[PDB]
């Protein structure tokens, strides 16, 4: 194989495939990138065995088919170390790979492409297309609620499910839950799968909002996303994600509505006032009013009252400031709505305008 590429075209990709890896080669070959040239394009592939990234690069100047494997980091630095605008002619020769540019010329060791733990193709059970911005919104609106290293592994990821012309994502960690749905103008069979935390993060990263629409493929043990010249593949978590519909407060009767920005500000100084930040906050709802207070049991305290739109039956309930603020920051809007029940049952925060996204937070002991 052989190819010549403006240093600028090869940089972005080189950096993408040999991306979030770099812990320690669990295996030699794993610290290598697979380079394949065939039919006008150059394909670079990186893997950690949980998820793989592929980058396609159009070969405009003369090129020659072939395939090999080379240390991802070293090769990247080499390229990154050349002056910008410099063309980079790469050529396989023996069991070494030559990188030549101007008069700088290096040669890296290799390992047979055949040995690269490349994923042998699979078959998608479902697939569709949505704007990159739609996927971005779905992941952004709910990813902060994923579990992290929880013992219930099926929680250390994000759920993806379809029904009708809609795609939704739901994340949870036992305590708070986020869910968001978006129409994608396509009749989808209803399906559901858990994408790993690390997979979601990467998918997130690779979205540039841009014109390129995203194209998704859910297989049976993997999920794939083509965004322009990149292709992300990840394994799905093998577990049963809990039913998010059974934990949404049922037929709520207590409903308050306030200014998002204001609710935030109040919790911010209920936090600042708390010397025991694990204690959290204590809210009190009464007709068109909300008394919030950082709660510290052995000290008397200053409470701040807010003018809110509430009514029905007054009550008190404890909350973890994080959870709540997380939701307010996620619901970047003017007014927020909250639906309650008990001082022991969950609550549901939501934009007062749209209902794409919904958040369920479990109250604190108090």
């Amino acid at each position: 194989m052989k190819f010549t590429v403006e240093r600028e075209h090869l940089l972005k990709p080189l950096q993408q495939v040999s991306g979030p890896l770099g812990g320690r080669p669990t295996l030699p070959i794993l610290g290598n990138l697979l380079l394949q040239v065939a039919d006008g394009t150059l394909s670079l592939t990186g893997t950690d065995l949980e998820m793989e990234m592929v980058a396609r690069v159009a070969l405009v100047q003369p090129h020659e088919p072939g395939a090999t494997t080379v240390p991802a980091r070293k090769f990247f630095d080499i390229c990154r170390g050349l002056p910008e605008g410099a063309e980079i002619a790469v050529q396989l020769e023996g069991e070494r790979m030559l990188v030549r540019s101007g008069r700088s010329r290096f040669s890296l060791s290799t390992l047979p492409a055949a040995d690269f733990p490349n994923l042998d193709d699979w078959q998608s059970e479902v697939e569709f297309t949505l704007p990159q911005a739609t996927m971005k919104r779905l992941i952004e609106a709910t990813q902060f609620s994923m579990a992290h290293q929880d013992v219930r592994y099926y929680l250390n990821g994000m759920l993806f499910e379809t029904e009708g012309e809609e795609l939704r994502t739901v994340a949870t960690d036992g305590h708070r839950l986020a869910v968001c749905s978006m129409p994608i103008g396509q009749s989808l069979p209803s399906h559901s799968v858990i994408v790993p935390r690390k997979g979601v993060i990467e998918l997130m990263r690779m979205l540039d909002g841009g014109d390129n629409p995203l194209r998704v493929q859910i297989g049976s043990n993997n999920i794939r996303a083509h965004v322009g010249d990149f292709i992300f593949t990840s394994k799905l978590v093998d577990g049963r994600f809990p039913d998010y519909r059974r934990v949404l407060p049922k037929n709520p009767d207590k409903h308050l509505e306030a200014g998002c920005d204001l609710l935030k500000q109040a919790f911010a100084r209920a936090a600042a006032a708390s010397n025991e930040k694990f204690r959290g906050v204590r809210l009190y709802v009464s007709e068109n009013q909300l008394k919030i207070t950082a709660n510290n049991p052995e000290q008397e305290e200053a409470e701040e009252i807010l003018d809110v739109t509430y009514s029905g039956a007054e009550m008190e309930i404890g909350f973890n400031v994080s959870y709540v603020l997380d939701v307010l920051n996620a619901l970047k809007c003017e007014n927020v709505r909250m639906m309650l029940t008990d001082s022991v049952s969950s609550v549901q925060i939501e934009d007062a305008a749209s209902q794409s996204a919904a958040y369920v937070v479990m109250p604190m002991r108090l």
């Binding site: 013992v151 219930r152 036992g174 930040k277 694990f278 002991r365």
Partner: protein
């Protein structure tokens, strides 16, 4: 406070499950076996959420304290293990553990671990609280 050796755990943990378990002793297998016995009989009755902390001068105790403070959407009870330092509780670990003895409710199964309780140190305000309500497995 009951005091029963590693060997007899399967019996006392089978009949009664405490809100606290002090698995002290510098024994490699006994300690493990005992906790793997509690986290075992635990899972039995609703405890799907487990946690663990390496107690030192860096541990985020709010995570802990606010953890005992939280309520789960799926009612999954929790098993809070703690890997105390090999030289017994430190200067003030006797304060937070005291705070912790206060945070304890029934869904939360505290499980402290380490080696023989610091000679006479045993007096810390916390150990005192747990005293009546828990079990002390001699994994020595």
């Amino acid at each position: 406070m009951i005091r029963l050796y590693p060997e007899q755990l399967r019996a006392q943990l089978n009949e009664g499950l405490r809100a606290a378990y002090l698995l002290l002793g510098n024994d490699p297998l006994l300690l493990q076996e005992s906790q793997d016995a509690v986290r075992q009989v635990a899972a039995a009755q609703g405890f799907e959420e487990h946690h663990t902390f390496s107690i030192d001068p860096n541990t985020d105790w709010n995570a802990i304290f606010s953890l005992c403070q939280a309520m789960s959407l799926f009612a999954s009870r929790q098993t809070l293990l703690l890997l105390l330092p090999e030289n017994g509780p430190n200067a003030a670990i006797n304060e937070q553990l005291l705070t912790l003895t206060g945070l304890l409710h029934d869904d939360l199964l505290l499980i402290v671990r380490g080696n023989k309780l610091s000679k006479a140190q045993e007096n810390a305000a916390w150990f005192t609280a747990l005293a009546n309500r828990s079990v002390q497995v001699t994994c020595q």
